[PDB]
Symmetry: D2
Subunit: 110 residues, 4 copies
Amino acid sequence: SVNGRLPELDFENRPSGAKLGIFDLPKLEVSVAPFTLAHIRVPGGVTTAEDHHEVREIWLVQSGSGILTLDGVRSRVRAGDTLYYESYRRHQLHNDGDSPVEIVSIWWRP
Amino acid sequence: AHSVNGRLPELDFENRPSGAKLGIFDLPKLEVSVAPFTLAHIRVPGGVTTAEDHHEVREIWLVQSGSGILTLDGVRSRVRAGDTLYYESYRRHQLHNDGDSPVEIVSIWWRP
Amino acid sequence: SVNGRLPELDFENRPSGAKLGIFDLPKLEVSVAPFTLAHIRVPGGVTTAEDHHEVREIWLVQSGSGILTLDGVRSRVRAGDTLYYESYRRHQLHNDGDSPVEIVSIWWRP
Amino acid sequence: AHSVNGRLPELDFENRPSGAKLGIFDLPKLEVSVAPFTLAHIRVPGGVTTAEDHHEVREIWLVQSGSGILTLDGVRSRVRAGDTLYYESYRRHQLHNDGDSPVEIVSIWWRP
Ligand SMILES: [Cl-]
Ligand SMILES: [Cl-]
Ligand SMILES: [Cl-]
Ligand SMILES: [Cl-]
Ligand SMILES: [Cl-]
Ligand SMILES: [Cl-]
Ligand SMILES: [Zn+2]
Ligand SMILES: [Zn+2]
Ligand SMILES: [Zn+2]
Ligand SMILES: [Zn+2]
């Protein structure tokens, strides 16, 4: 740790006569999934903060309808639309309906 | 919610300054290596023939010392120090050290 | 390819005096996502085939209701439930309603 | 569906023998390495000091030949052939070869 060395190899003697040593690297706690799964609820009248991030992102719009602004281009989305945002694309959703927009969001590091 | 139904817990929603709400699904956790590969050293003494390998992980061999005869999908070829090999998934490989010196290999394996 | 050798290294001379050679590995076409995203529609009366696979899997049940059998244990799921299936758990869904069960499925290699 | 709305195409559903229907979302594709890491050789001639590195990728150094003085987050230490080092993300590292021989390193880097 202080100088970052890995422990010395413990070699296994294999039946063939070969020797095999596996490097013992640090462990860490991770999610079973290589992505983050979330739900976004946008009430009526809400505009989300303009998002931009290196993680890639998918939106599965489940309910409601809104004006997506994607890199300056406005378009309407609704329940049943599915969207993919490449790294760093600027996205923002304005819900101009009475009922909430419900979104399943998935994001992951490229 | 439990392992018997596989059901994930109810979401806890956070309020964002915009008025939107964000809930993150709480998935199960796991202890894994800091590395998405396995790093290994293989030493093949003089006269040894490794076991014929046939596995799903991709594999890189950085041959460091010595020399021997790689058999790769039935094709015989010589490999020596400074060679670097890449074995696509499920390719049969087997090394016979016909020298007197050990062949030393840094091996990297990972799931496609 | 015939003997699997990588091409010889092309070393770059760095301003420090060090040399850096990067190994040129084979390329391949992949999805931008490290998982597969799908939709499963189970009509009324349908029972899905008993699934089992090494990939991990999440179901986001969007609509309808059914009897999940998970490793021999029966339970009811509905729209709004979200499920995680570890590698090799046996899952199967019977839709005993009039209307279809709609599921967003995500699977990925552990 | 296009890049201007980011919208994915409508699903094409397949009938399964059970009566269920399966549609797979068609996501965009990309050319990547067969390996989830970058594999490199670093050669530090006698007297050379590498640039101080400070980056997000994790890094493994398999020192093969020679010897020098690693500086790791301001701590000076000697590294020699046969040493294997692991640099967690954003750890400052810099190698000074105070010998006459080159230090040769197999370096592996990857995104946490
Ligand atoms: Cl927001
Ligand atoms: Cl709606
Ligand atoms: Cl063996
Ligand atoms: Cl089925
Ligand atoms: Cl429903
Ligand atoms: Cl440098
Ligand atoms: Zn976002
Ligand atoms: Zn092997
Ligand atoms: Zn399944
Ligand atoms: Zn570095």
